[PDB]
Every structure is written in C-alpha cells, then in structure tokens.
C-alpha cells in the first residue's frame, strides 16, 4: 500500500529528454562471486553514453539504443565491465518520466509505451514478493586474474 501510494503519480509522459545523465551499471559484488551479471542487470534499459570495448573511441553500442537480448549478448562477448545507463531517477521530465529513461516494459519486448503507468507496476512488483521474504582476517583470491 505504501509503495503504491508513494507512486501512482508517475506515468511515462514523454518519449525522450536528451539527458546525458544516468547511473553507471556495474555487476554487483558483495565479496563473493558475481551475484548478478551485467547482462541480466542492464538488459532492457537505454544507455546514456556510448559503451566502448577495450579498443578506445569505439562505439560498440550507440548512445540511445535499448539494450535488448542481441545487444546484451554482444556485450558479454566483448567483455564489457561497466555500462552507463539512463536511469529513471536522472530523468528531468516533470510530472512523469520519459520512455527512454525507463527502458523495456519487462512485459513486452519493446520500449515502454508513452503513457503506461509504471509507478503502480513498480510498487506491485516490489510488494508481491513481500510474502516470500523472511523476518529473522585475510583476503584470498578465488581464480586466476
């Protein structure tokens, strides 16, 4: 209820904002192995700046292209490390957010439709697994590198 009601005023009101800001998506490490690879962490989101492979000044992925399955598969074989992506927080749209700053609908294989309420979608997605939650040296290298 709290999640839905802090939301429900946020809908996709625009298609783009031309904002270069965003969040640098990096695979999360909490001391152990890769909990979530970058392939499954940036999938379906539109980048903010051109990603580059070890070769410098290389436009591997352009600035404002949605990262579908093909782009993510290309990212893995090019061995990318951190990809800057357009975050909904960084969006400067008033009374809503633009489609590019949000990304894939996560229910259809395309960019989010201009208008679709994503605040309620996000609130329900967060609150649904609430019933499935719970209530209560030295540094050693793991592999070659």
């Amino acid at each position: 209820r709290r999640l839905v009601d802090v939301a429900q005023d946020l809908v996709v009101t625009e298609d783009d904002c031309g904002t270069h800001e965003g969040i640098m998506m990096t695979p999360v490490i909490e001391g152990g192995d890769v909990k979530e690879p970058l392939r499954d962490r940036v999938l379906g989101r539109v980048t903010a700046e051109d990603v580059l492979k070890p070769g410098t000044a290389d436009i591997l992925v352009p600035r404002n292209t949605l990262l579908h399955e093909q782009w993510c598969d290309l990212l893995e074989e090019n061995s990318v490390d951190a990809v800057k992506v357009r975050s909904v927080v960084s969006c400067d749209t008033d009374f809503g957010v633009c489609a590019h700053c949000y990304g894939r609908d996560l229910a259809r294989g395309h960019i989010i439709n201009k208008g679709e309420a994503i605040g309620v979608i996000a609130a329900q997605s967060i609150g649904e697994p609430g019933t499935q939650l719970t209530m209560r040296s030295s540094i050693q290298v793991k592999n070659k590198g």
Binding site: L43, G44, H68, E69, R104, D105, L106, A107, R108, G109, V120, I121, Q124, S125, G127, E128, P129, T131
Partner: protein, 319 residues
C-alpha cells in the same frame, strides 16, 4: 454494546472509512465467485465458466439480444424467459460469449497479473475453470481457492481487456523479463520424465527418420519413451535477414526429446530440448521462444507443451 460510536471522522479515515471502502476500491455489479477447476483442455486465452454464471452476469446482454431477435417483445417477458432458462436462452447466451472477455480476479491481487482477461467457455458445472499455466501467475491453488469474475461492458472495456489483460498478452511478468506462464508443477514433471534416458531401454540404438517416427515407435509400444536413439530433424534457424533456413542432421538424442521437437516452433534450435528439461530449462526455453519467435508462436508453443507435458506425465505414472 459499550463500543465507541462512529463519528464524522471515523467514516472518512481508516479501512472502513469512505475513502478506502467506497472510493479507492468499491464493490461492483456483473460479478460472480466460485471455486476454481483446472480444466487442462482450455487454452490460456480462454477459461471455463459455468452456465449459471454466464446467464446471471450477462443478463442485460441476453435481454438485448432477445429484443433484437424478437424472441421477447419486452424486457419484462425476456427476464421471465431468462428465469425459465428456456433452451432458446442458452443459444442466445452462446452468442454473447463468443468474443466477450471476462476479468478473472483472485482476492489477494498482489501484482498486475492478479487479474487477467479470458474468453469464457460455457461449461456445465458450478466451478470456474482456470487455465493451468496462469495458476502460477495468479498464485492460485486448487484447494478451495475462489476468484471473482468481472464482465467488461462497453466496447472500450472489452476491447482493452482483450488487447492488454488477456493471458496471451501477459507472458512476461512486470517484475522481470522472465516468463510467468512457464510450466510450473505437473507439466514440467512430465517433460522432465520425457527428456531423460536409460542406458539400456527398449528400442535403443536404431536410427529414426524424425519425430513422427519417434511418436510412432512410442505409441506402438515397441520402443521406450526415453531411449538413446539417433534421429533426423529439420532444425530451422533464422540466421538470415528474417528468413528461416533449414538444417538437417543426425543429432544423437532420445525418443522423448524427439517427441517434443514437433511441439516447438520452427525457429527454436534443437539444443534447447536435448537436456533433462527441468523448470529452469523450460523457463529458458520459453524466454528464448518469446525473444525469437514473438508472441503468438510463443502462446501456441506454450499450449502445445502444456498438452504434451500433461499427457506424458499421465503416461509416466510418476507416483
């Protein structure tokens, strides 16, 4: 009864206040409830629905059709005709349920996919029949679980229910790109039993012309369901600019894995049906099918895989 008596502010605040009891969410007409039934014969675009429930919910539609066809001159006579449940009324009812979606609705609608549209299939009985695949999306059991059915009235309502709320249109959950209609409990067990192998099983070793020959051998009973046999398959790949190319090869596999090959659409490769095919493997299969073929082929493939999983789990006898 020595209790605080409700004031002019106790009816504007709280769960029982006007806001959250009568404005935020309010009771509705054209609504009915019953326990739910599996009914595997259905397709996820449709659901079973009792005759009494379709008669009561669609009473205005039946009255309108009766007036249009002149069976009853007046609403009053038509209402009496609906009470008599005359045979002509059922034929009229089948006309108003041809393409009229209804919103299946479980009580704890935690997320977006809690309520989904369905084309009602008139069934005799008193229990709503819910497609097996969407039970995971609904988080719905078959242990007395009841879900309400709502009838969209206006063309806008029915049309947007068909375009958005249909289970065919809800394959990937809003939380994550992973499919939500994935084979969950029994069909996955049937597929897992189907896609295995004995090191020595009946009818192991001979080469098979194709999946049709594998089905012929299994049904005839002269070859075990899971025996390591080489088969010839026409694997289709769309590596071209949308065109599907055909690759024919003798891939070593089992009879059971060859059975599933006729189910999968053309675009999918054979490397996805050549494993034990657990829950995670089937989820990855459905995700690849959605990302390659699209939506309609994914729906048809999900229905066919549900059918085969149920049938060969029944044939398995996994006690």
């Amino acid at each position: 009864n020595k209790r605080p008596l409700k004031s002019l502010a106790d009816m504007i605040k709280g769960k029982q206040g006007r806001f959250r009891q009568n404005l935020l969410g309010k009771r509705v007409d054209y609504s009915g409830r019953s326990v739910i039934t599996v009914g595997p014969y259905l397709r996820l675009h449709q659901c079973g629905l009792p005759k009494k429930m379709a008669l009561e919910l669609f009473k205005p539609f039946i009255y309108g059709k009766l007036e249009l066809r002149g069976l009853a001159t007046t609403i009053k006579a038509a209402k009496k005709m609906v009470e008599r449940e005359e045979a002509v009324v059922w034929d009229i009812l089948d006309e108003v349920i041809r393409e009229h979606p209804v919103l299946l609705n479980r009580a704890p609608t935690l997320h977006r996919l809690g309520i989904q549209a369905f084309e009602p299939v008139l069934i005799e009985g008193k229990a709503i029949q819910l497609h097996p695949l969407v039970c995971a999306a609904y988080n719905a059991d078959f242990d007395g679980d009841q879900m309400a059915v709502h009838v969209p009235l206006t063309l806008e309502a029915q049309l947007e229910a068909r375009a958005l709320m249909m289970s065919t249109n809800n394959i990937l959950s809003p939380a994550n790109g992973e499919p939500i209609i994935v084979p969950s409990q029994d069909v996955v067990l049937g597929l897992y039993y189907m896609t295995r192998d004995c090191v020595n099983a009946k009818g192991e070793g001979m080469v098979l012309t194709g999946p049709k020959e594998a089905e012929r051998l299994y049904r005839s009973g002269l070859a075990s369901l899971h025996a390591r046999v080489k088969v010839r398959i026409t694997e289709y790949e769309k590596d071209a600019n949308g065109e599907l190319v055909a690759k024919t090869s003798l891939k070593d596999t089992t009879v059971g894995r060859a059975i599933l090959w006729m189910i999968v659409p053309k675009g999918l490769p054979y490397s996805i049906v050549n494993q034990a095919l657990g829950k995670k493997a089937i989820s990855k299969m459905l995700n690849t099918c959605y990302r390659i073929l699209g939506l309609k082929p994914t729906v048809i493939f999900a229905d066919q895989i549900m059918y085969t999983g149920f049938a060969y789990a029944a044939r398995s006898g996994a006690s």
